[PDB]
Amino acid sequence: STPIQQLLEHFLRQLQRKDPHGFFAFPVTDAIAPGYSMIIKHPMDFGTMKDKIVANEYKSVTEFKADFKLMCDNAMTYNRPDTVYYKLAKKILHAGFKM
Ligand SMILES: CCN(CC)CCNC(=O)c1c(C)[nH]c(/C=C2\C(=O)Nc3ccc(F)cc32)c1C
């Protein structure tokens, strides 16, 4: 466990606490969200981010934040504003930017 890995695992744990039901914690399927794989060119989720930490693909907190922002932007693009997914993506994007 390197310092960067420890730091990012801490950040990821705090972010996921804002998503207790795992809206953003798994690879979305077209069966769940028809059209998703065509609309969202660069999908991202917390499970994939955890794997990228372990593979040590993040060389910076800025890279980690880029993936988090991507995850949130994707959810706010596919889902209409009056949905639980858009609303939670917006709230955790803002709260993640704090830390
Ligand atoms: C007929 C469909 N109805 C009109 C929209 C509502 C039904 N909607 C549903 O069932 C549904 C469910 C149960 N999950 C999602 C989508 C996502 C999810 O869970 N995590 C995500 C993360 C990113 C993202 F971009 C989409 C999702 C939908 C659309």
Side-chain angles (χ1 to χ4, degrees), residues 4 7-8 11 49 52 57-70 97 99:
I4 194 156
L7 179 62
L8 295 187
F11 285 160
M49 293 175 71
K52 284 173 80 161
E57 288 173 50
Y58 294 121
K59 286 202 73 117
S60 40
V61 188
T62 50
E63 280 157 39
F64 175 87
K65 294 184 181 263
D67 265 352
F68 175 63
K69 179 169 183 293
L70 172 62
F97 264 20
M99 331 184 307

Side-chain angles (χ1 to χ4, degrees), residues 23-24 26 28 32-33 36 40 71 74-75 78-80 85:
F23 289 7
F24 304 123
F26 66 102
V28 177
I32 290 162
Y36 172 85
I40 299 308
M71 189 187 73
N74 287 341
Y78 178 86
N79 303 104
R80 277 174 294 179
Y85 308 106

